[PDB]
Amino acid sequence: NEVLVLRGTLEGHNGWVTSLATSAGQPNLLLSASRDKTLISWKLTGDDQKFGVPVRSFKGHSHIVQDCTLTADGAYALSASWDKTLRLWDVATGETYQRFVGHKSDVMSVDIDKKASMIISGSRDKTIKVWTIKGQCLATLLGHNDWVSQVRVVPNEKADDDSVTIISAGNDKMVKAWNLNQFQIEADFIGHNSNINTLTASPDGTLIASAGKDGEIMLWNLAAKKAMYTLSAQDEVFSLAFSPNRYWLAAATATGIKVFSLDPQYLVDDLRPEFAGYSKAAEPHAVSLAWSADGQTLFAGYTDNVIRVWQVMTA
RNA sequence: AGGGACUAUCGGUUUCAAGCCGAUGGAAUUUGAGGCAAUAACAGGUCUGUGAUGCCCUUAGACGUUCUGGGCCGCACGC
Numbered sequence: 001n002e003v004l005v006l007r008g009t010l011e012g013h014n015g016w017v018t019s020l021a022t023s024a025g026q027p028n029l030l031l032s033a034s035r036d037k038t039l040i041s042w043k044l045t046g047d048d049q050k051f052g053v054p055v056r057s058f059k060g061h062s063h064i065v066q067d068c069t070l071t072a073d074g075a076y077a078l079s080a081s082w083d084k085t086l087r088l089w090d091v092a093t094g095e096t097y098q099r100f101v102g103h104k105s106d107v108m109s110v111d112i113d114k115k116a117s118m119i120i121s122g123s124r125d126k127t128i129k130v131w132t133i134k135g136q137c138l139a140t141l142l143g144h145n146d147w148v149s150q151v152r153v154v155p156n157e158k159a160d161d162d163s164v165t166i167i168s169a170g171n172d173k174m175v176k177a178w179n180l181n182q183f184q185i186e187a188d189f190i191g192h193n194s195n196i197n198t199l200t201a202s203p204d205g206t207l208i209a210s211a212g213k214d215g216e217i218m219l220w221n222l223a224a225k226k227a228m229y230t231l232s233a234q235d236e237v238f239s240l241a242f243s244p245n246r247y248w249l250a251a252a253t254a255t256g257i258k259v260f261s262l263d264p265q266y267l268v269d270d271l272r273p274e275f276a277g278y279s280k281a282a283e284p285h286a287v288s289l290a291w292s293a294d295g296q297t298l299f300a301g302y303t304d305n306v307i308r309v310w311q312v313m314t315a
Numbered sequence: 316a317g318g319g320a321c322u323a324u325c326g327g328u329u330u331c332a333a334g335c336c337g338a339u340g341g342a343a344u345u346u347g348a349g350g351c352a353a354u355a356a357c358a359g360g361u362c363u364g365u366g367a368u369g370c371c372c373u374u375a376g377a378c379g380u381u382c383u384g385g386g387c388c389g390c391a392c393g394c
Binding site: 014015016036037062279282284 | 319324325326327339340
């Protein structure tokens, strides 16, 4: 039934959209990512023209943003980039509470646990490093031999003990899940055929996805740690997306979005629309995606310089 | 003190080699510019820079030295 219809975008950046972020406490309060050294804050007013007011740039690094994770409260935006950081931005404002420095090779990430505290970040030095909500390390993990690509938060409804769990990534072709308090050892994902360039997580504590340079999307549990639904999607995803509470997958496969539908096992609905003056090898192929925090609004993002948000509505 | 630019990023253009346009970012035609500048030389110039210097000449009516005065600034004109 669900005819998914393709609508007004929100265009704005000069470089190349490379993440994007579900606001995670004020789902308007969009908050978007970059390549050309900012973060254009887009409202969703919504009211039609502009779908819905590009109200704070935020400028820079010196170099290219690969991320922009919102807090558990959702008004404090956490940077990264190719000049070896963080720089915690204020969503409201233009400012740098705490330069977090220290890496060597080019952050690839950023994420924040359910209370806004013991943050993490991958790298190319081939680690990891915790930097609390101060430029300071708990510790500097080293179990991987590689470019560890991405790490995620998971959002726990066994109501949290308190010695918790997070995750990771990927040229050694593996994952590894680090107690976020005292980085202990828990399981990994063996097998794959090249680069793990992403992963994702459950919106309670028992779901995950990884993904593709091979084609296959190798799925989860964390609270079963057993390898799952093994799909086959040709090119790659660069750019994965849970609906929050539907059971819909969203990931941007080059080519679709393949909604795969992680219950039964079907292709509902592929969005490759809209398109004007190209030689293929121009599509202006994505690099970040999200599901309205409250879970409709897919904020579909693309290279080019035009975000193209595309919600699901009625038959 | 240091860092920082590599024609970089797609797009073309080609033996899809070495290369070459264009547009973006950029502070930024080999980044601009000089300076060092093999191989072999020329009988180019210079002993009128030398207490660097061969061989001739000069050696006190010296062509060595020095006080004066003018001389290289003299014009129908050629470059």
